[PDB]
Design a protein around this ligand. Structure first.
Ligand code: NPO
Ligand code: CA
Ligand code: CL
Length: 496
């Protein structure tokens, strides 16, 4: 449940938000594979309701109507092809399992669905599953509205409707078996694990009862007796009834405090400084390292006021976003997830974006493909953060220093920071508004290394800055506060 099950040596996964299956398969072959990425978290693959008001938002995929692999991203055939093609190049697939609810209770009856299945939310009829009115928690929820009115009461958050969505009676074996059959189908196809959506809104014991019904991973790609990787989405920034630790027995948990606090440090708000990251990790009040799934931003909080609020860094703040992802990829704490998104037109009224519903680039509802430009970037408004040199090369940095301990920390007592990972990688940051000039102990062998942030190592030469480390392991670094990317990272495989 805690092991990623990635092909040995790979240590990160990317969230290819709203990407089509044919696009993800191609990406696995031409990029994710050779570039050393561990896996891909895909959007919900099961059928959802069609929301035309607003026009096809990204959130309609979180309103199920059946368990058929039929969505805007593709059909069952294309899903199987993608999982097969990715596994063959060493890139795993993790599925976003939306199992706490079905569609909204106030949706209209009919076949307004991604695959044509009929459903009647008002009567709780989902014939495709099939589900009926007694498969929901209507009578278990004690609030006057039927929804979650207080987050300080664990009963209503787990038994009431989340934003008006029909809450599944996960205590019944019928529902538990129904879901388990859906997840098992996915495992037989070749999926390596799942992101259990809205786990905070379900009882830990019910999730457990569903996980106990799951098969072992497909032996065509996984060692015998392999258990699926499980990471649960529970938002716990402290001061609340439900805690992340309640779910430690089922699998890993999303550590939302991570990006909330990293963003605050990097934006330099509230008196925070980068030098305070010397004890980053559990020392900052986070869950255990071997239970966490970390990230800077996710699909939800990047486009709104999810967990972390204004402090969350996104691609809109490119310069600082790269600094943050770089620190996350270099630090040993948790299992890392990189974000890959699409651009939308923001419209802030009173500090809040009211266009945060906007879905992926599309042509009359059909998702546009991901085109690749000559400089390896993406077109059609797909930002492809995972394709940025700095994110990409740090993904490589991490695979290289995997298992190495945190070492040789250093800071100017303000916002200039540096640290290594054993004798295989060293990174240095300048988040102060003035020059950085120091002769630091790197812990690496002597020689000339290529900086993987400003360039790459092609042949016996570097396309960017070169850092020379002397026989004793020391090296002179110079970073200007005006520099495009204010940090340098070198490692064992960038050595000349
Ligand atoms: O999961 N989401 O943030 C959602 C899902 C459905 C909804 O109507 C609003 C938000
Ligand atoms: Ca629930
Ligand atoms: Cl998440």
């Amino acid at each position: 449940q805690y092991a990623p099950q990635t092909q040995s040596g790979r240590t990160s996964i990317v969230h290819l938000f709203e990407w089509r299956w044919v696009d993800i398969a191609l990406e696995c072959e031409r990029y994710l594979g050779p570039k050393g990425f561990g896996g891909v978290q895909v959007s919900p693959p099961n059928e959802n309701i069609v929301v035309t008001n607003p026009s096809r938002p990204w959130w309609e995929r979180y309103q199920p109507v059946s368990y058929k692999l039929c969505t805007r991203s593709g059909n069952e055939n294309e899903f199987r092809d993608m999982v097969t093609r990715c596994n063959n190049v060493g890139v795993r697939i993790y599925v976003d399992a939306v199992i706490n609810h079905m569609c909204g209770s106030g949706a209209a009856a009919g076949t307004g669905t991604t695959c044509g299945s009929y459903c009647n939310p008002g009567n709780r009829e989902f014939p495709a599953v099939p589900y009926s009115a007694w498969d929901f928690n209507d009578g278990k929820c004690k609030t006057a509205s039927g929804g979650i009115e207080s987050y300080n009461d664990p009963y209503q958050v787990r038994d009431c409707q989340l934003v008006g969505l029909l809450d599944l009676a996960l205590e019944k074996d019928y529902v538990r078996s129904m879901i388990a059959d859906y997840l098992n189908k996915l495992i037989d196809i070749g999926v390596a694990g799942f992101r259990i959506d809205a786990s905070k809104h379900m009882w830990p014991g019910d999730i457990k009862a569903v996980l106990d019904k799951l098969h072992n991973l497909n032996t065509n790609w996984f060692p015998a007796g392999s258990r699926p990787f499980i990471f649960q989405e529970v938002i716990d920034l402290g001061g609340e009834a439900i805690k992340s630790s309640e779910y430690f027995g089922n699998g890993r948990v999303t550590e939302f405090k991570y990006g909330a606090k990293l963003g605050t440090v990097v934006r330099k708000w509230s008196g925070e400084k980068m030098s305070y990251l010397k004890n980053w990790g559990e020392g900052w009040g986070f869950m255990p390292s071997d239970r966490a799934l970390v990230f800077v931003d996710n699909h939800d909080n990047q486009r709104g006021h999810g967990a972390g609020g204004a402090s969350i860094l996104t691609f809109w703040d490119a310069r600082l976003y790269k600094i943050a992802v770089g620190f996350m990829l270099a630090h040993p704490y948790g299992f890392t997830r990189v974000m890959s998104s699409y651009r939308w037109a923001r419209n802030f009224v009173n500090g809040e974006d009211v266009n945060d519903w906007i879905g992926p680039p599309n042509n009359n509802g059909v998702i546009k493909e991901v085109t690749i430009n000559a400089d390896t970037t993406c077109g059609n408004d797909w930002v492809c953060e995972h394709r940025w040199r700095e994110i990409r090369n740090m993904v490589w940095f991490r695979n290289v220093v995997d298992g190495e301990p945190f070492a040789n920390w250093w800071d100017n007592g303000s916002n200039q920071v540096a640290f290594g990972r054993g004798n295989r990688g060293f990174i240095v940051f300048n988040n102060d508004d003035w020059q950085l000039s120091s002769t630091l102990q790197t812990g690496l062998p002597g020689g000339t290394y290529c900086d993987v942030i400003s360039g790459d190592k092609v042949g016996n030469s570097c396309t960017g800055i070169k850092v020379y480390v002397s026989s004793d392991g020391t090296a002179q670094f110079s970073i200007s506060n005006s520099a495009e990317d204010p940090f340098i990272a070198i490692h064992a495989e960038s050595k000349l």
